[PDB]
Design a protein around this ligand. Structure first.
Ligand SMILES: Nc1nc2c(ncn2[C@@H]2O[C@H](COP(=O)(O)OP(=O)(O)O)[C@@H](O)[C@H]2O)c(=O)[nH]1
Ligand SMILES: Nc1nc2c(ncn2[C@@H]2O[C@H](COP(=O)(O)OP(=O)(O)O)[C@@H](O)[C@H]2O)c(=O)[nH]1
Lengths: 218, 236
């Protein structure tokens, strides 16, 4: 029972990555719900909040032994590799929903950046995360958990096309989706796969209860 | 000899980097587009780069195009005409993002706004984000959209094969780099994009076409766009 939202500018490979992970709400079979949404927000917030209402209403009921959890457990936020950081629309969106959903920031179409360019954009996005007091999902073995945090935000490449593993062909070379020397796709997936319970659990224990307390107080 | 080259398009599309490669070096008022204009001698060249998005920015560019027409009309209407300084925009690279499936309707209306006043040369920026197959689909979608909407881009005139193959590339999909490599280029873990490598991208054609068509761009600007502006202007 798990729900993942992907949000971001149109044309940033949002759909291709989702397809790459698993090989406007689609529901494939754990039971995964995916909600892809292209940025141009008062409906996005409201969708998220509406899933807390159903759940609060449902858990408040006399019949429970068929409750559907539609709460969004994670939101990949896609950032253009063309900016030098977060655009203020991106910051405003993330601030609108950071108290309600687990944000995982992702740099899109990372095959657009040299390694030097990549690390400048990551450093700059992390600093802006701090500067604007934005609350992104924080990961909870030794060195593999070390290396994964030290590469947030993940800069990914999607493709489901094959190359004489999946990749993208340019006259000067081939980007390999699952080569970590090429991009953080494997890390993002592994992280998604290894952290589902926590994602679910932080959604329950933190975002939903905060929703719930303000409600029963008001 | 005087040439003014303008480049417009969203920021983050490599526009300065491209310009740098050709030679190796809130917008709301005509004034600040002038302040953006750099002058180099390489022939007196002026480069005028304008980040587009807020659609007032498009109105200022238009107003700016005309002001250069105005300067000229005013200067040739006066009594001392020895050096009329020609600041009329002879060319507009229009950078389109490789992330769209074509032109947005803003681009379309804007190009319709400026297409009887400057020579639009459309350019797909950051072409190293596109596989060759993607490159073709975007080129065709962009040309279709120009037909569909009757956008008048600059028609290259007409050793033999060099004109055909150059036309075939329009709109040119280009790559710029300030960095050098072993060539100006872009180093990725998987390979190196070479700017001047025509297999890799159409930069070589853009520069060659500019270098080669500069006189005709100037002339079309004079004989067509300018005289069109001047006829309309005097009527009022
Ligand atoms: N350079 C690059 N291009 C990509 C990548 N992923 C997808 N694309 C291209 O971008 C197009 C749009 O991707 P899409 O998933 O539809 O983006 P979306 O609008 O955010 O869902 C795809 O058809 C691919 O041709 C990537 O990782 N790198
Ligand atoms: N992938 C790619 N990146 C580029 C290209 N040209 C420039 N860049 C990168 O994009 C950054 C910003 O480009 P810039 O020229 O300042 O874009 P402008 O805002 O349109 O003037 C540069 O520092 C380069 O890192 C290109 O052809 N391809």
């Amino acid at each position: 029972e798990f729900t993942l939202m992907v949000v971001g500018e149109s044309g940033l490979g949002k759909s291709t990555l989702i397809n790459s992970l698993f090989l406007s709400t689609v529901e494939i079979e754990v039971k995964l719900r995916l909600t892809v949404v292209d940025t141009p927000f008062k409906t996005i917030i409201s969708y998220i909040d509406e899933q807390f209402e159903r759940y609060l209403h449902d858990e408040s009921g006399l019949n429970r032994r068929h409750i559907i959890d539609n709460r969004v457990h994670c939101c990949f936020y896609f950032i253009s590799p063309f900016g030098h950081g977060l655009k203020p629309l991106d910051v405003a969106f993330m601030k609108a929903i950071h108290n309600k959903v687990n944000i995982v920031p992702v740099i899109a179409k990372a095959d657009t950046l040299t390694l030097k360019e990549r690390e400048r954009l990551k450093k700059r996005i992390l600093d802006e995360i701090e500067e604007h007091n934005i609350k992104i999902y924080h990961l909870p073995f030794k060195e593999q958990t070390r290396l994964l945090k030290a590469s947030i935000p993940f800069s990914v490449v999607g493709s489901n096309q094959l190359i004489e593993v999946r990749g993208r062909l340019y006259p000067w070379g081939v980007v390999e989706v699952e080569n970590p020397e090429h991009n953080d796709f494997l890390k993002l997936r592994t992280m998604l796969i290894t952290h589902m319970q926590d994602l679910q659990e932080v959604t329950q224990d933190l975002h939903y209860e905060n929703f719930r307390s303000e409600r029963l107080k008001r």
